[PDB]
Amino acid sequence: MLGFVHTAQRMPDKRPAAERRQDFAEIYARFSDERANEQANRCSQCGVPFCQVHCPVSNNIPDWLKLTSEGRLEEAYEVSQATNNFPEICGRICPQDRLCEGNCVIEQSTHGAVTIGSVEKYINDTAWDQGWVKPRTPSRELGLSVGVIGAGPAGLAAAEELRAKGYEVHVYDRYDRMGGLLVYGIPGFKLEKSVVERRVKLLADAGVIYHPNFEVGRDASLPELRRKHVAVLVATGVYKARDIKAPGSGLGNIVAALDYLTTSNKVSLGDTVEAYENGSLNAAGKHVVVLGGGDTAMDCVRTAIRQGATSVKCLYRRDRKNMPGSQREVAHAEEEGVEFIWQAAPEGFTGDTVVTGVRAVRIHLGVADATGRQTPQVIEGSEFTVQADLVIKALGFEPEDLPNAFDEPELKVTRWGTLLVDHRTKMTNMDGVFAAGDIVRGASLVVWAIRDGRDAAEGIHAYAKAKAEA
Amino acid sequence: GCEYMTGGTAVILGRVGDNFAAGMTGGMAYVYDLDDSLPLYINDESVIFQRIEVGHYESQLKHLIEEHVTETQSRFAAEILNDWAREVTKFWQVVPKEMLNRLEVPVHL
Ligand SMILES: Cc1cc2nc3c(=O)[nH]c(=O)nc-3n(C[C@H](O)[C@H](O)[C@H](O)COP(=O)(O)OP(=O)(O)OC[C@H]3O[C@@H](n4cnc5c(N)ncnc54)[C@H](O)[C@@H]3O)c2cc1C
Ligand code: SF4
Ligand code: SF4
């Protein structure tokens, strides 16, 4: 069942940029059945599977690969979901060209990578489409109160696992629509809002109680939370911003990326807010500039070209190769009709309380030293002005203030602002308080949150039983 | 340095000593100066120091430094090579006063 000698790799589908630039629908239609039999057969069932080592959740890929190559989709779906929760979204969001589909031995031999992500997506959609899906209710419910702060992917995964373990968990978050920033941060252009509501419905079906539209920083305090429950898991996530203080900043028509994204995509999907027409977050057909090079900037320029017609540019200080996002994303963006500027940084915001333009310079990167860093140096040779009326300050995130501000004068964090947890138990400095998600590691991916959530749930169960032993 | 040299090529990166190229007869040299302090050191009896203008000698020096950085894995030579367009103008070319008319390639425009 090796196959890859003769058959050639081919992605499922790709809608051209003619109709894609207008709608918010997906770009990838689902995968065909004969294509399923053909492309799943393409793998080599490589001994010592590198695809498993590099996968952050470490799920048994070649097993269901061979299965789908032979059929038998029931046990295939079973063995696929036995190890990784949230299979559809994790499969569709993973930057596979660098995590799992970037190390398949067939790809190192330049033959092409096995389309593992599409196989995961397809095997998890067909399985749901024919009712082979059920919640996980615990038999002989033990009965204990546990709380989770933050309904991100990590919190939801830990909640599902603990509900399967035999506990009673409560979900605290700040938004009305549960499901982490998946329903607010991630754009629908890359992840439609059906799978998330489906999975959160399945969660609620298992017997989990939600505490929607709360503010644990204001509505209550961590001592009260711990007194109400037996163990608490803080997964509040990161939501702060890093801005610049260039000459002429802080004036009108500048804004962060997260708010513009969430409102002008998700709340316009719901048709409720007025800032889409009241605020400047609209289709100003003149120009748009976006600072930063992370995936936030990529999704920002994507949704900017989607929402109305404009001419957009992007400014980034590093080079194309050190960009953290997926190179398929920048390829799609260039196909949509965006313009990129490499190795440049903004120095001034010229305007009259309204942004008229941006004054920027060009930098150069020397040769990397022993540690692997390439120091940047300004050139001064070409400092140019770029015309636009709105700039988007997408410069990443950083831990908010957690110890002092949120709840606890007794909470240990490092110089980064993030707190510390044990590599074995994932228990914080304070007893009964565990951590997981992106708070401990910083801005990371979804599957990392999933792995941390699973480990945190296991450690929570262990510690709870050990404490109840007395 | 290069005292009484007669033929070949000598590429030098960095500061030079005193009385450089004293009694030079034939050949050609290149020097990577950084502060225009070369005229206070070189001996101008029978040699002349100028700048590179012809693409042929530029390509020759480029290939020499490329092979050098390929050989010894030196990071400083790589830092020079990556900034070739900017750092090409700092190089001084030292040519004897005897090959002004005998060179196959015209050294002067
Ligand atoms: C392809 C791709 C694209 C990505 N795009 C983006 C992007 O555009 N933007 C981005 O930010 N990340 C992006 N990421 C990163 C990813 O979304 C996050 O790293 C990950 O979702 C972190 O989730 P989490 O479980 O740590 O919880 P988070 O998603 O970090 O959020 C934690 C939860 O706590 C809630 N919460 C926040 N404050 C409080 C509070 N005070 N009290 C109680 N609850 C609170 C939040 O509402 C949220 O539900 C992307 C990742 C990938 C792979
Ligand atoms: S990812 Fe590589 S090693 Fe794993 S099954 Fe596919 S071809 Fe074989
Ligand atoms: S999507 Fe995630 S779980 Fe699936 S193969 Fe890629 S890295 Fe592994």
Curated annotation (Swiss-Prot), chain A:
Signal peptide: none annotated. The keyword rRNA-binding does not apply. Its EC number is 1.4.1.13. GO terms for biological process: L-glutamate biosynthetic process. Keywords: 4Fe-4S, Amino-acid biosynthesis, Glutamate biosynthesis, Iron, Iron-sulfur, Metal-binding, NADP, Oxidoreductase. InterPro entries: DPD_II, FAD/NAD-bd_sf, FAD/NAD-binding_dom, GltD-like, Helical_ferredxn. [4Fe-4S] cluster binds at residues 90, 94, 100, 104. This is Glutamate synthase [NADPH] small chain. It comes from Azospirillum brasilense. The gene is gltD.
Curated annotation (Swiss-Prot), chain B:
Belongs to the glutamate synthase family. Aggregate of 4 catalytic active heterodimers, consisting of a large and a small subunit. It comes from Azospirillum brasilense. This is Glutamate synthase [NADPH] large chain. Disulfide bonds: none annotated. Glutamine binds to the large subunit and transfers the amido group to 2-oxo-glutamate that apparently binds to the small subunit. The lineage of its organism: Bacteria, Pseudomonadati, Pseudomonadota, Alphaproteobacteria, Rhodospirillales.
